[PDB]
Amino acid sequence: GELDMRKIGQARNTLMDMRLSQVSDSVSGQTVVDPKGYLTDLNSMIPINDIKKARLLLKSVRETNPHHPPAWIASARLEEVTGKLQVARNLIMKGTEMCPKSEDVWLEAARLQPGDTAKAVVAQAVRHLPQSVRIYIRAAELETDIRAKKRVLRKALEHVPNSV
Amino acid sequence: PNSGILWSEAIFLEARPQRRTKSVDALKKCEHDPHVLLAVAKLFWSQRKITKAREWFHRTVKIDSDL
């Protein structure tokens, strides 16, 4: 009787696919995909409101106490623990100008900024609060040189010679 | 029931597709036993699985090396 009319369509589709696959040889820039390979990257990718509430509480504590370097350090830690480091660097630069003569805030601002900015931050912290052993140690640690660290150690010995 | 040699004899006298539950019952009843671990290593080596039999023999040598 009436045979499977879909057989002709299947044969035509197979012929078209074979012709396309053969023509694919001439495609020099032919490229493929790896969903199965990506599957390993998706399985390896496995690691909100409370973090936003903590960030809002840190912002309210910084607005209620601008001269609190524990509040500025907590705001910098909350901004650097999640999201981007630019907001943490801006908060550290705001806390260094709002609460001067603080060793912990200057240490957090030196740890949050890059070294080209950390050198200027350590220079500003030495100009605002000199004879600091932690600021001098952070400046000698962010020098990446022998002569620069020797000059920083000589400046720390000339400023505060009673530091072990 | 708390005998390693009796559990090994019961795992060896049982059927080959029925030993996978008998070894689990011997491990659950008498745990950390050298004879039960040696019987599990022999059952893993008899099932053409050297990658599990080597780990079972290493665990049997680490649990009791005096056997």
């Binding site: 078209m16 012709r19 969903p35 199965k36 599957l39 | -």
Partner: protein, 111 residues
């Protein structure tokens, strides 16, 4: 609507029985012309969605906004519309989980 649905039914059946109308080697010639044009352009083909993207979460935000715009201003939403709104809110709440699910559906789901 009923008549068009019926007509599309026998049209799809006729396409299945008679097979594709793309003539043999004609679709091949069209593909050869297309690939020659692309090679002349010489552009890098788009790859699979990478793990790292410039603004991956931004695309999810835009898609969520686009789906919300369908019935956000509406006074009320249907049960299916309510479920869609809940799904959109869940996706917005957890962008990373939604992105992982979308990638998994892309690379695994085919039905």
């Amino acid at each position: 609507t009923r008549l068009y649905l019926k007509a599309e039914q026998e049209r799809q059946h006729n396409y299945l029985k008679d097979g594709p109308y793309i003539t043999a080697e004609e679709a091949v010639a069209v593909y050869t012309t297309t690939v020659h044009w692309l090679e002349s352009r010489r552009f890098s083909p788009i790859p699979f969605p990478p793990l790292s993207y410039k603004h991956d979460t931004k695309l999810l935000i835009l898609a969520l906004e686009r789906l919300k715009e369908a019935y956000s201003v509406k006074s009320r939403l249907n049960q299916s519309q309510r479920e869609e709104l809940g799904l959109i809110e869940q996706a917005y709440d957890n962008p990373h989980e939604a992105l992982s699910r979308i990638k998994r559906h892309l690379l695994t789901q085919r039905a």
